[PDB]
Design a protein around this ligand. Structure first.
Ligand code: HEM
Ligand code: HEM
Ligand SMILES: CN(C)CCc1cc(F)c(F)c(CCc2cccc(N)n2)c1
Ligand SMILES: CN(C)CCc1cc(F)c(F)c(CCc2cccc(N)n2)c1
Ligand SMILES: C[C@H](O)[C@H](O)[C@H]1CNc2nc(N)[nH]c(=O)c2N1
Ligand SMILES: C[C@H](O)[C@H](O)[C@H]1CNc2nc(N)[nH]c(=O)c2N1
Ligand SMILES: [Zn+2]
Lengths: 416, 414
């Protein structure tokens, strides 16, 4: 059974057979669509040998199909080897080749990711020999150095040991490797990034001396083998930052804004062949709107819309003057211009969405589909003047995958 | 099963139980979400004598509840009466009060409509006594004049006779009552509105003498009782139009842009108690972005971003200058400025989405929920700085409802 999607601006129609290979559930039913639910239980997140071998087998079948060795003796022997390792040891270990395939394909299957044209050019760092928080800090520093590359950013992921009994998890407690602190003041205002107030408090409680500034890089809070997490400060020379200025507005620099260069997600779960990798930080490079639209202008983040609109002297009485929309465009022009001027990799939302359309069409050609989440793919500004807005998309769940997981401070058992 | 929706800007959480009354189907499964498909089979649309009565019963049951007479003398009586009329005539006719209720609730249940906070204020015009296209034209003119109201716009729907056998359908062939024509030029490009090129040709291919301008109001093409349709010119004095100028850039009026004040969808199918109304033009008032973002700036429409940006002298050599975004804002400031200057009702996208959040809150409070289609409720510019962006929405299909329906010229035995 085949399915079609139409781009309504170009009348291009594509045929999806890949959704047939989909196992996991979406969250929708025939009588209700949950397409706009942010964290549906299905997309969030121990396994027993009962269900683990079929998950291994399906993954290995995929893997050996991709290398043109399906049904080969190398393929049959590996299946046998994994089987016996599961029955006697209860889990199994991926080879290096399988881990690299898995991480790439989890990104390939990331239906909310607009940057997936780059998916096969991913640098995979195997940190499965790591045993301690210090060991983790070392692997993460090397990730940040390699990925940053003096501004010429390179996609990378670092993979720490897989979950075993769920009581010895490796976790990076930060949501991203590099993020700014946020501080609730006694008068109710917030200093810094309001998204990080809760995590900032945990760090301070674990002993972090906070500078209490508006752009303080947070410490790494790292958990090895289920032990209590430990604080480490990324060396500042590894944290590339871009001061934000505007190409016409000389007064923009006086807002004292800066942002970091490397977007590196660190709280997600990597699932490959039934195995769960609970610490797997990954990084690419920023699309401009992530910083200029969401980070700076969300009412619940830095929320600089007013300060910018004031200095532009806009009619701020009625909303129908679109002063909000006007300040937003200027802030996003500044973010792009500051990054480009400093030769730090960044992509605008027009370029990135055009690329995704080309990626998606190619994926239908050579793979039979490309799972896509329209709600997340469409940029948070100027939606319809980007070609994804006019593109029908089918959302379904393939593995390997990145999944959400509960914040560790709500599940951790404290040693003391 | 008693589901929850969170707003992530405010942490407000609403519980939805209304969805458990949903009847029709979404197109999704638990294996694949179709939330971005524009027209699944379900959203498009005779009855056997059997499937008609359960539909009638469900509608009457919710009608009599809304008036607090569920399980009353009048309820069971009407129920029996509709039962008997169906056994005999194999259809039935709605009472005036039921027709009004059914129309307001088709709008109440339209999950892609952001303007639904106004749903109970709708003016319903019963046109079920109509028999000819000339009469149809008369009802539509009266609709237009009433809804326009000298620029103080008012919501209205006009309901033509319901389908009987499918051979005698009433249909308005225009997609909206008021739309601008579109002509294909000798040199490949398109003059006027490209969305209307086929329909603009059908009118000519029917007898319309086009002035071949850029903003030529289309004639009405009205089909009564399954007959061949007929052309009709809407009196100009009834078509309120707004010249578009900018409150800062005097060169903006030189661009020669105008738009019409009345958005009046005329090609949808209204379904009440299983009865199908194939001609039910309805109208409200515009949200600014429908014109300024989509109508003006869609690449497959008027596509004027190239010109506005040049006249703004912006660096159009790199997308990373965001010149499209910058021009897009100015256009949409102009549209709002022009309408508000000429005292024609219009709402900006910030106001409408704020009102929709308030409408959701009301519906969750007094009704138990509110079907909502995020892909359509979030405006096509400045998405995340409107409160609907951060709003989780549950999409499900309730009835009475508006459904899409095939274009008549593909169906009619001409
Ligand atoms: C190379 C440049 C990349 C760009 C421009 C990019 C862009 C984006 C954007 C804008 C989002 C939406 C997130 C939001 O708005 O909050 C997203 C989501 C996502 N990205 Fe990419 N990304 C890139 C690389 C990567 C890499 C290297 C990985 C993993 C190896 C990845 C995995 C994901 C995933 C899993 C999501 C979904 C998050 C969720 O389900 O909530 N991305 N990406
Ligand atoms: C009074 C002010 C109104 C406003 C501001 C408004 C706004 C909107 C907007 C912006 C859309 C998105 C469609 C698009 O972008 O093309 C929409 C869809 C819709 N509106 Fe409303 N509308 C109003 C009145 C009405 C009325 C009076 C009715 C019927 C009684 C109605 C029924 C609908 C329906 C059925 C749809 C969606 C069609 C579909 O399912 O694809 N609206 N509306
Ligand atoms: C709930 N909300 C905070 C989710 C934020 C979030 C969660 C994720 F898992 C995720 F991969 C991304 C994408 C961020 C990103 C990664 C790589 C490159 C890039 N340019 N951007 C963003
Ligand atoms: C995909 N597209 C071709 C569908 C067009 C379409 C179909 C509809 F039923 C519909 F109600 C509207 C909204 C137009 C409208 C109606 C009332 C007020 C307003 N401000 N605007 C637009
Ligand atoms: C409620 C809604 O699902 C939520 O606000 C989503 C909408 N789309 C998004 N799209 C992206 N890219 N990133 C986001 O964080 C969100 N948030
Ligand atoms: C492909 C996609 O479903 C299509 O572009 C939809 C998206 N959202 C929309 N939203 C509104 N309000 N109007 C539209 O026409 C559309 N088109
Ligand atoms: Zn769905």
């Amino acid at each position: 059974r085949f399915l079609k999607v139409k781009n309504w601006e170009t009348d291009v129609v594509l045929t999806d057979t890949l959704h047939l290979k989909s196992t996991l559930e979406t969250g929708c039913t025939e009588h209700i669509c949950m397409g706009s639910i942010m964290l549906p239980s299905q997309h969030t997140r121990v396994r027993t040998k009962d269900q683990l071998f079929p998950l291994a087998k399906e993954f290995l079948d995929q893997y050996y199909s991709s290398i043109k060795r399906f049904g080969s003796k190398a393929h049959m022997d590996r299946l046998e080897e994994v089987n016996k390792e599961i029955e006697s040891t209860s889990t199994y270990q991926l080879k290096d080749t399988e881990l690299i395939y898995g991480a790439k394909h989890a990104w390939r299957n990331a239906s909310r990711c607009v940057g997936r044209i780059q998916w096969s050019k991913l640098q995979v760092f195997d940190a499965r020999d790591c045993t301690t928080a210090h060991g983790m800090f070392n692997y993460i520093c090397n990730h940040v150095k390699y990925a940053t590359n003096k501004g010429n950013l390179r996609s990378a992921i670092t993979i720490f040991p897989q979950r075993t009994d769920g009581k010895h998890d490796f976790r990076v407690w930060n949501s991203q490797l590099i993020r700014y602190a946020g501080y609730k003041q006694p008068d109710g205002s917030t200093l810094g990034d309001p998204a990080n107030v809760q995590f900032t408090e945990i760090c301070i409680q674990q002993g972090w001396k906070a500078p209490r500034g508006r752009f303080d890089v947070l410490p790494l809070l790292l958990q090895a083998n289920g032990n209590d997490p430990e604080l480490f400060q990324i060396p500042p020379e590894l944290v590339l930052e871009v001061p934000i200025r505007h190409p016409k507005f000389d007064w923009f620099k006086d807002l004292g804004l800066k942002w970091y260069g490397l977007p590196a997600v660190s709280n997600m779960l990597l699932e490959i062949g039934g195995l769960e990798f609970s610490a797997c930080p990954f990084s690419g490079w920023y699309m401009g709107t992530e910083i200029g639209v969401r980070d700076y202008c969300d009412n619940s983040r830095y929320n600089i819309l007013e300060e910018v609109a004031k200095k532009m002297d806009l009619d701020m009485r009625k909303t129908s003057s679109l002063w909000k929309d006007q300040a937003l465009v200027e802030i996003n022009i500044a973010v792009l211009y500051s990054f480009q001027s400093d030769k730090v990799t960044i992509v605008d939302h027009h370029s990135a969405t055009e690329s995704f359309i080309k990626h998606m069409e190619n994926e239908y050609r050579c793979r039979g589909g490309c799972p896509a989440d329209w709600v997340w793919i469409v940029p948070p500004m100027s939606g319809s003047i980007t070609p994804v807005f006019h593109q029908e998309m089918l959302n379904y769940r393939l593995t390997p995958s990145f999944e959400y997981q509960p914040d560790p401070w709500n599940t951790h058992v404290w040693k003391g």
